[PDB]
Each structure stands twice: as structure tokens, then as C-alpha cells.
């Protein structure tokens, strides 16, 4: 998250923390969000080989009672998910075992929006020890037309191009909500980190969510 806020320790109870291993690299992180105490929702490109999840973290250097490390049984990325494109970027995270619900862990084109995230504060900054937020503006479509492969219908066009604020990397797959709603799940930018960014628009996945949350 860049230009936001260090969040109110565990303001947002549903924030998930991934540590994603690959064969062939060292471990990625993003975030995702609990939507039901065994499901967590993030980005299809944050995907790998296997996934531990951490619910009820702030400071995520610092264990504490409240963190719930939950193993993932299986990902459930979008069929339709494109490498190129990051078209269908959403994906569902099966938890082993459902998470306990506490204080801090439970489920969850102008106007103002909030994301959360643990992702980098700069293009030269590392990843945030502590959960960040963030308000950003929703885009008109026009203003992600230079993402050659935007589409209006499947994406949000989010953060105002005349403030550095925005999503960045690290923050892939951590929720966007509007007046508390999740709208959106952060997706893709620009490497030098000029919003607006790319988020998926989580209404047009609802059926393919029900159809992963009720067969399994
Ligand atoms: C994550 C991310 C990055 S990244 O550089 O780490 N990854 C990336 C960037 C651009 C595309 C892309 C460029 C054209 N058309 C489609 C996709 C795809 C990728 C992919 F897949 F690796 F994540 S910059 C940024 C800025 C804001 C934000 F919120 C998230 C990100
Ligand atoms: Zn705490």
C-alpha cells in the first residue's frame, strides 16, 4: 500500500496474509480475505505450489494469540484465468480445517473506496510489517484505457492518477471495499506504481463463488 495508513490492529478481522511457495523461487506473499470460515478469496496470480494463510495478524513479524496459521487443502483458481490478459484474476483458497472465529478473525465511478494490505509502500520499499489501508477513487473505465487488456466488465479502475496513493505489490488479492462493501480484489498495476490500478469486480464471479462455495 502506498500514501496509506497503518491499520487499527485488527480493524479488519477478515484480512488473510499468504505466503505462497513455488518449485523453483523463494516464497511470494499477497493478501485474500475470509468469506467463510474454511474459504479465502484473493488473486488468481497468487497461485503456487502450495499456501499457508495467516488470519489475525497486524504486525505480521510478531506472533501473537490472535494469529490462526491455517493450512490450505486446495486452490481453486478460475478456469478462465488468462496469464496474459489477467483476465478472471480470483481464486478460491479451501482452508483444511474452518478458522475460529475472534475479536480478531471473522468473515466478511466516483466514489471513495478502502483496501488493506501488507504489499510494498514504494516502488524501492519492502513489504509492510503492518497491515496498511488506504482510500482510493473510483476510476470511470477511460482512465485504464493505456491497460490494453482493461475490460469495464470484469475489472474496477481504481486510484486517482493525481495522488500517489494505490495498491502495489504485495497487495495483489486483498479486498476493495465500498462503504463497506467488497467490490473489488486488487490485481494489477504499473511497475512504477502510477494508479490507477486493475482490480477484479467481484460481482461478475458471484455465481462461479457459489457454485465452489456450495459443492464444497
Ligand atoms: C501485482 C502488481 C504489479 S507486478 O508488476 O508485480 N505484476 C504485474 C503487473 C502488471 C501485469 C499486467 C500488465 C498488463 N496487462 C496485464 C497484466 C501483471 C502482473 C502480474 F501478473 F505479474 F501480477 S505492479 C502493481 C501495481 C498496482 C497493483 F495494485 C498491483 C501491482
Ligand atoms: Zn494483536
Redesign the pocket.
Known amino acids: 500500500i502506498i500514501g496509506g495508513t497503518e491499520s487499527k490492529p485488527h480493524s479488519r478481522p477478515y484480512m488473510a496474509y499468504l505466503e505462497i511457495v513455488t518449485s523453483n523461487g523463494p516464497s511470494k506473499f499477497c493478501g485474500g480475505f475470509l468469506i467463510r470460515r474454511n474459504f479465502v478469496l484473493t488473486?488468481a496470480?497468487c497461485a503456487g505450489r502450495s499456501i499457508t494463510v495467516t488470519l489475525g495478524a497486524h504486525n505480521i513479524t510478531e506472533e501473537e494469540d490472535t494469529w490462526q496459521k491455517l493450512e490450505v487443502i486446495k486452490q481453486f483458481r478460475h478456469p478462465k484465468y488468462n496469464?496474459?490478459?489477467?483476465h478472471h484474476?480470483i481464486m478460491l483458497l479451501k482452508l483444511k480445517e474452518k478458522a475460529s472465529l475472534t475479536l480478531a478473525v471473522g468473515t466478511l465511478p466516483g466514489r471513495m473506496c478502502r483496501?488493506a494490505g501488507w504489499?510494498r509502500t514504494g516502488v524501492l520499499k519492502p513489504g509492510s510489517d503492518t497491515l496498511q489501508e488506504v482510500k482510493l477513487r473510483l476510476m470511470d473505465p477511460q482512465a485504464c484505457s493505456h491497460?490494453?487488456?482493461?475490460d469495464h466488465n470484469l475489472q474496477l479502475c481504481?486510484?486517482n492518477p493525481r495522488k500517489t496513493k494505490?495498491?502495489?505489490?504485495?497487495?495483489?488479492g486483498g479486498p476493495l471495499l465500498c462503504a463497506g462493501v467488497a467490490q473489488g480484489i486488487?490485481?494489477?498495476?504499473?511497475?512504477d506504481?502510477k494508479?490507477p490500478?486493475?482490480?477484479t469486480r467481484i460481482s461478475h464471479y458471484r455465481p462461479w463463488i457459489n457454485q465452489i462455495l456450495q459443492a464444497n
Request: no cysteine.
Open positions: 488473486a496470480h496469464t496474459s490478459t489477467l484474476d483496501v504489499g491497460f490494453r487488456d482493461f481504481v486510484g494505490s495498491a502495489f505489490k504485495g497487495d495483489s486488487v490485481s494489477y498495476g504499473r511497475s506504481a494508479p490500478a486493475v482490480f
